[PDB]
Protein backbone atom coordinates (compact mmCIF):
# COMPACT_ATOMS: atom_id res chain seq x y z
CA UNK A 1 0.00 0.00 0.00
CA UNK A 2 3.10 2.33 0.18
CA UNK A 3 4.81 1.10 -3.07
CA UNK A 4 5.63 4.05 -5.41
CA UNK A 5 7.64 2.20 -8.13
CA UNK A 6 6.58 2.50 -11.77
CA UNK A 7 7.98 2.99 -15.27
CA UNK A 8 8.48 6.80 -15.22
CA UNK A 9 11.79 8.71 -15.25
CA UNK A 10 11.56 9.29 -11.48
CA UNK A 11 10.30 5.84 -10.33
CA UNK A 12 11.31 3.45 -13.16
CA UNK A 13 13.75 0.52 -13.41
CA UNK A 14 16.88 2.65 -12.59
CA UNK A 15 15.32 3.58 -9.21
CA UNK A 16 13.89 0.19 -8.08
CA UNK A 17 17.10 -0.92 -6.27
CA UNK A 18 16.58 1.74 -3.55
CA UNK A 19 13.40 0.04 -2.20
CA UNK A 20 14.25 -3.45 -3.64
CA UNK A 21 18.03 -4.02 -3.29
CA UNK A 22 17.71 -7.51 -4.92
CA UNK A 23 17.38 -5.46 -8.18
CA UNK A 24 21.21 -5.79 -8.28
CA UNK A 25 21.14 -9.52 -7.34
CA UNK A 26 22.75 -12.56 -8.91
CA UNK A 27 19.74 -13.94 -10.86
CA UNK A 28 17.71 -10.92 -12.08
CA UNK A 29 15.36 -10.92 -15.09
CA UNK A 30 14.90 -10.21 -17.91
CA UNK A 31 18.13 -10.97 -19.83
CA UNK A 32 19.33 -10.87 -23.40
CA UNK A 33 19.24 -14.35 -24.96
CA UNK A 34 22.45 -14.74 -26.98
CA UNK A 35 21.26 -17.49 -29.39
CA UNK A 36 24.85 -18.44 -30.35
CA UNK A 37 25.94 -18.84 -26.62
CA UNK A 38 22.81 -20.75 -25.43
CA UNK A 39 23.66 -24.43 -25.41
CA UNK A 40 21.39 -27.20 -26.54
CA UNK A 41 20.69 -29.45 -23.48
CA UNK A 42 19.62 -32.91 -24.82
CA UNK A 43 18.58 -33.82 -21.20
CA UNK A 44 15.80 -31.08 -21.38
CA UNK A 45 12.32 -32.56 -21.76
CA UNK A 46 9.47 -31.36 -23.95
CA UNK A 47 7.38 -28.84 -22.12
CA UNK A 48 3.92 -30.13 -20.99
CA UNK A 49 1.34 -27.31 -21.23
CA UNK A 50 -2.02 -28.69 -20.00
CA UNK A 51 -4.59 -25.85 -20.30
CA UNK A 52 -7.73 -27.84 -21.37
CA UNK A 53 -9.43 -27.40 -17.92
CA UNK A 54 -8.27 -23.77 -17.37
CA UNK A 55 -10.83 -21.59 -15.54
CA UNK A 56 -10.25 -17.86 -16.22
CA UNK A 57 -12.10 -15.61 -13.74
CA UNK A 58 -11.30 -11.92 -14.07
CA UNK A 59 -9.17 -9.25 -15.78
CA UNK A 60 -7.61 -6.54 -13.61
CA UNK A 61 -5.75 -3.27 -14.42
CA UNK A 62 -3.23 -3.19 -11.51
CA UNK A 63 -1.59 0.12 -12.56
CA UNK A 64 1.47 -1.64 -14.08
CA UNK A 65 -0.17 -4.05 -16.58
CA UNK A 66 -3.41 -6.04 -16.82
CA UNK A 67 -3.70 -9.54 -15.36
CA UNK A 68 -6.04 -12.27 -16.60
CA UNK A 69 -6.54 -14.33 -13.44
CA UNK A 70 -7.33 -18.05 -13.15
CA UNK A 71 -8.75 -20.40 -10.55
CA UNK A 72 -5.54 -21.91 -9.10
CA UNK A 73 -7.30 -23.74 -6.20
CA UNK A 74 -7.00 -27.11 -8.13
CA UNK A 75 -4.74 -28.64 -10.86
CA UNK A 76 -6.76 -27.24 -13.81
CA UNK A 77 -4.16 -25.45 -15.98
CA UNK A 78 -0.64 -26.78 -15.29
CA UNK A 79 2.89 -26.57 -16.65
CA UNK A 80 5.22 -29.54 -16.17
CA UNK A 81 8.25 -31.05 -17.87
CA UNK A 82 10.94 -29.07 -19.66
CA UNK A 83 13.45 -28.00 -16.96
CA UNK A 84 10.83 -28.36 -14.19
CA UNK A 85 10.41 -31.01 -11.51
CA UNK A 86 6.80 -31.21 -10.26
CA UNK A 87 3.64 -29.39 -11.14
CA UNK A 88 3.14 -25.65 -11.62
CA UNK A 89 -0.38 -24.14 -11.61
CA UNK A 90 -1.35 -21.18 -13.82
CA UNK A 91 -2.41 -18.19 -11.66
CA UNK A 92 -2.42 -15.30 -14.18
CA UNK A 93 -1.06 -14.00 -17.43
CA UNK A 94 -0.14 -10.46 -18.41
CA UNK A 95 1.89 -8.58 -21.03
CA UNK A 96 4.62 -5.96 -21.22
CA UNK A 97 4.61 -3.70 -24.29
CA UNK A 98 6.04 -0.56 -25.82
CA UNK A 99 4.99 2.89 -27.01
CA UNK A 100 6.39 1.82 -30.47
CA UNK A 101 6.35 -1.50 -32.31
CA UNK A 102 10.21 -1.64 -32.07
CA UNK A 103 10.22 -2.00 -28.25
CA UNK A 104 8.21 -3.57 -25.45
CA UNK A 105 9.64 -7.04 -24.75
CA UNK A 106 11.58 -7.64 -21.52
CA UNK A 107 13.69 -10.50 -22.82
CA UNK A 108 15.63 -9.76 -26.02
CA UNK A 109 16.96 -12.22 -28.61
CA UNK A 110 20.43 -11.27 -29.93
CA UNK A 111 19.57 -7.73 -28.64
CA UNK A 112 16.34 -7.74 -30.74
CA UNK A 113 13.30 -6.25 -28.96
CA UNK A 114 9.80 -7.50 -29.79
CA UNK A 115 6.65 -5.31 -29.62
CA UNK A 116 5.43 -7.12 -26.50
CA UNK A 117 5.95 -10.14 -24.27
CA UNK A 118 3.30 -12.43 -22.70
CA UNK A 119 4.03 -13.91 -19.27
CA UNK A 120 2.01 -16.97 -18.22
CA UNK A 121 2.74 -17.20 -14.49
CA UNK A 122 2.68 -20.57 -12.69
CA UNK A 123 3.52 -21.59 -9.10
CA UNK A 124 4.98 -24.83 -7.75
CA UNK A 125 2.18 -26.78 -6.01
CA UNK A 126 4.61 -28.23 -3.42
CA UNK A 127 4.55 -24.73 -1.74
CA UNK A 128 0.75 -24.71 -1.33
CA UNK A 129 0.07 -21.06 -2.39
CA UNK A 130 1.55 -18.36 -4.62
CA UNK A 131 2.64 -16.21 -1.63
CA UNK A 132 4.77 -19.09 -0.23
CA UNK A 133 6.06 -20.02 -3.71
CA UNK A 134 7.55 -16.54 -4.42
CA UNK A 135 9.82 -17.03 -1.35
CA UNK A 136 11.46 -20.12 -2.94
CA UNK A 137 14.18 -20.38 -5.61
CA UNK A 138 12.03 -22.90 -7.54
CA UNK A 139 8.66 -21.34 -6.62
CA UNK A 140 7.52 -20.03 -10.03
CA UNK A 141 7.71 -21.00 -13.70
CA UNK A 142 6.95 -18.15 -16.11
CA UNK A 143 6.33 -19.06 -19.76
CA UNK A 144 7.38 -16.06 -21.85
CA UNK A 145 6.11 -15.60 -25.41
CA UNK A 146 7.19 -12.78 -27.74
CA UNK A 147 4.69 -10.75 -29.75
CA UNK A 148 5.56 -9.31 -33.16
CA UNK A 149 3.29 -7.03 -35.15
CA UNK A 150 1.86 -8.58 -38.33
CA UNK A 151 -1.28 -10.74 -38.70
CA UNK A 152 -3.92 -10.58 -35.89
CA UNK A 153 -3.90 -13.30 -33.20
CA UNK A 154 -7.57 -14.44 -33.16
CA UNK A 155 -7.22 -15.92 -29.63
CA UNK A 156 -6.12 -12.46 -28.28
CA UNK A 157 -9.18 -10.53 -29.54
CA UNK A 158 -11.40 -11.27 -26.46
CA UNK A 159 -8.65 -9.67 -24.30
CA UNK A 160 -8.38 -6.63 -26.65
CA UNK A 161 -12.18 -6.14 -26.64
CA UNK A 162 -12.55 -5.99 -22.79
CA UNK A 163 -9.74 -3.41 -22.27
CA UNK A 164 -12.24 -0.49 -22.63
CA UNK A 165 -13.86 -1.73 -19.39
CA UNK A 166 -10.57 -1.71 -17.36
CA UNK A 167 -8.98 1.51 -18.63
CA UNK A 168 -7.62 2.70 -15.25
CA UNK A 169 -5.78 1.30 -12.23
CA UNK A 170 -8.02 -0.72 -9.90
CA UNK A 171 -10.70 -1.57 -12.49
CA UNK A 172 -11.60 -5.23 -13.01
CA UNK A 173 -14.09 -7.09 -15.19
CA UNK A 174 -15.50 -10.63 -15.40
CA UNK A 175 -13.35 -12.65 -17.77
CA UNK A 176 -14.65 -16.22 -17.64
CA UNK A 177 -14.29 -18.90 -20.31
CA UNK A 178 -11.08 -17.51 -21.86
CA UNK A 179 -8.87 -20.23 -23.39
CA UNK A 180 -5.16 -19.37 -23.01
CA UNK A 181 -4.30 -22.09 -25.57
CA UNK A 182 -5.27 -19.42 -28.18
CA UNK A 183 -2.16 -17.38 -27.22
CA UNK A 184 0.46 -20.14 -27.90
CA UNK A 185 2.64 -20.41 -31.03
CA UNK A 186 2.88 -23.75 -32.93
CA UNK A 187 6.31 -24.77 -31.52
CA UNK A 188 7.13 -25.27 -27.80
CA UNK A 189 10.91 -24.97 -28.50
CA UNK A 190 12.32 -22.85 -25.66
CA UNK A 191 15.23 -21.32 -23.81
CA UNK A 192 15.43 -21.63 -20.01
CA UNK A 193 17.46 -19.98 -17.21
CA UNK A 194 17.04 -19.18 -13.50
CA UNK A 195 15.82 -15.65 -12.85
CA UNK A 196 13.45 -13.32 -11.04
CA UNK A 197 10.20 -11.44 -11.13
CA UNK A 198 10.69 -8.55 -13.57
CA UNK A 199 8.71 -6.13 -11.34
CA UNK A 200 9.15 -5.25 -7.67
CA UNK A 201 9.61 -7.14 -5.41
CA UNK A 202 12.03 -8.69 -8.00
CA UNK A 203 12.16 -11.97 -6.02
CA UNK A 204 14.62 -14.56 -7.33
CA UNK A 205 12.01 -17.32 -7.53
CA UNK A 206 11.46 -17.92 -11.28
CA UNK A 207 12.47 -20.66 -13.68
CA UNK A 208 12.12 -18.75 -16.98
CA UNK A 209 10.92 -20.69 -20.04
CA UNK A 210 11.00 -18.40 -23.11
CA UNK A 211 9.53 -19.76 -26.33
CA UNK A 212 11.64 -19.33 -29.49
CA UNK A 213 8.60 -18.82 -31.79
CA UNK A 214 6.84 -15.47 -31.41
CA UNK A 215 3.11 -15.04 -31.95
CA UNK A 216 1.91 -12.41 -34.46
CA UNK A 217 -0.62 -9.76 -33.27
CA UNK A 218 -2.04 -6.97 -35.42
CA UNK A 219 -1.10 -3.29 -35.17
CA UNK A 220 -4.73 -2.68 -34.02
CA UNK A 221 -4.46 -5.24 -31.18
CA UNK A 222 -1.30 -3.66 -29.70
CA UNK A 223 -2.68 -0.10 -30.33
CA UNK A 224 -5.54 -1.00 -27.92
CA UNK A 225 -2.99 -2.09 -25.23
CA UNK A 226 -1.45 1.41 -25.53
CA UNK A 227 -4.82 3.14 -24.75
CA UNK A 228 -4.79 1.71 -21.22
CA UNK A 229 -3.83 3.98 -18.31
CA UNK A 230 -1.31 3.59 -15.48
CA UNK A 231 -3.36 6.11 -13.42
CA UNK A 232 -6.60 5.66 -11.53
CA UNK A 233 -9.94 7.15 -12.73
CA UNK A 234 -10.11 10.94 -12.14
CA UNK A 235 -6.29 11.22 -12.07
CA UNK A 236 -4.16 12.79 -14.83
CA UNK A 237 -3.99 10.39 -17.79
CA UNK A 238 -0.66 8.57 -18.27
CA UNK A 239 -0.84 5.98 -21.05
CA UNK A 240 0.18 2.46 -20.01
CA UNK A 241 3.11 2.04 -22.43
CA UNK A 242 6.77 1.02 -21.98
CA UNK A 243 5.94 -1.12 -18.93
CA UNK A 244 9.06 -3.28 -19.50
CA UNK A 245 12.26 -3.72 -17.51
CA UNK A 246 15.41 -3.71 -19.70
CA UNK A 247 17.78 -6.69 -19.91
CA UNK A 248 19.85 -7.26 -16.74
CA UNK A 249 23.39 -8.65 -16.39
CA UNK A 250 23.52 -12.43 -16.94
CA UNK A 251 26.23 -12.82 -14.24
CA UNK A 252 26.94 -16.46 -13.32
CA UNK A 253 24.18 -18.03 -15.48
CA UNK A 254 23.93 -20.14 -18.65
CA UNK A 255 20.88 -20.17 -20.90
CA UNK A 256 19.92 -23.67 -22.10
CA UNK A 257 18.10 -24.42 -25.39
CA UNK A 258 15.59 -27.28 -25.76
CA UNK A 259 16.36 -27.40 -29.54
CA UNK A 260 19.22 -27.52 -32.15
N1 LIG B 1 6.65 -10.03 -14.86
S1 LIG B 1 6.77 -11.45 -14.11
O1 LIG B 1 8.15 -11.68 -13.82
O2 LIG B 1 6.08 -12.45 -14.88
C1 LIG B 1 5.94 -11.37 -12.54
C2 LIG B 1 6.14 -10.31 -11.64
C3 LIG B 1 5.44 -10.33 -10.42
C4 LIG B 1 4.59 -11.38 -10.15
O3 LIG B 1 3.88 -11.41 -8.92
P1 LIG B 1 3.03 -10.25 -8.26
O4 LIG B 1 1.59 -10.61 -8.57
O5 LIG B 1 3.45 -8.85 -8.63
C5 LIG B 1 3.29 -10.51 -6.50
C6 LIG B 1 4.56 -10.78 -5.99
C7 LIG B 1 4.73 -10.97 -4.63
C8 LIG B 1 3.63 -10.90 -3.78
C9 LIG B 1 2.36 -10.63 -4.27
C10 LIG B 1 2.21 -10.44 -5.63
C11 LIG B 1 4.41 -12.40 -11.04
C12 LIG B 1 5.07 -12.41 -12.23
ZN1 LIG C 1 5.72 -10.02 -16.57
From Swiss-Prot:
GO cellular component terms listed in the entry, alphabetical order: apical part of cell; cytoplasm; cytosol; extracellular exosome; myelin sheath; plasma membrane
Regulation: Activated by X-ray, histamine, L-adrenaline, L- and D-phenylalanine, L- and D-histidine, L-His-OMe and beta-Ala-His (carnosine).
Effect ascribed to mutating residue 62 to D: Strongly reduced activity
Limits of the Alpha-carbonic anhydrase domain: 3-259
Feature type site, description Fine-tunes the proton-transfer properties of H-64: 7, 62, 67
Effect recorded for residue 142 to G: Weakly impaired activity
Effect in UniProt of substituting residue 67 to Q: 2-fold decrease in enzyme efficiency, as determined by kcat/KM ratio, and efficiently inhibited by chlorzolamide
Gene3D superfamilies: Alpha carbonic anhydrase
Phenotype when changing residue 121 to A/G/I/L/S: Reduced CO(2) hydrase and p-nitrophenyl acetate esterase activities
Outcome of mutating residue 121 to K/R: Strongly reduced CO(2) hydrase and p-nitrophenyl acetate esterase activities
Result of altering residue 18 to E: In Jogjakarta
Cofactor binding, per record: Zinc. Can also use cobalt(II) with lower efficiency, but not copper(II), nickel(II) and manganese(II).
Outcome, altering residue 198 to D/E: Strongly reduced activity, but enhanced zinc affinity
SMART domains: Carb_anhydrase (SM01057)
Modification type Phosphoserine: residues: 2, 165, 172
Site label Involved in the binding of some activators, including histamine and L-histidine, positions: 92
Gene Ontology molecular function: any one: arylesterase activity
Phenotype when changing residue 64 to G: Impaired activity, not rescued by 4-methylimidazole (4-MI)
Mutagenesis / variant outcome for changing residue 197 to A: Reduced CO(2) hydrase activity
Compartment(s) of residence: Cytoplasm; Cell membrane
Cofactor: Zn(2+); Co(2+)
Further details from the record: Target of drugs used in treatments against glaucoma disorder and breast cancer.
Record protein name field: Carbonic anhydrase 2
Source organism of this protein record: Homo sapiens (Human)
UniProt lineage: Eukaryota, Metazoa, Chordata, Craniata, Vertebrata
Amino acid sequence: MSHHWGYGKHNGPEHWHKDFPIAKGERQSPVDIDTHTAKYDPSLKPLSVSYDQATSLRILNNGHAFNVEFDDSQDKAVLKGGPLDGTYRLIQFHFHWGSLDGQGSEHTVDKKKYAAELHLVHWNTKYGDFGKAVQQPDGLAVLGIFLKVGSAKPGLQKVVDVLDSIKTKGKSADFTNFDPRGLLPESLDYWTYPGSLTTPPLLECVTWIVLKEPISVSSEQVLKFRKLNFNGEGEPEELMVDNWRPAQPLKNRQIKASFK
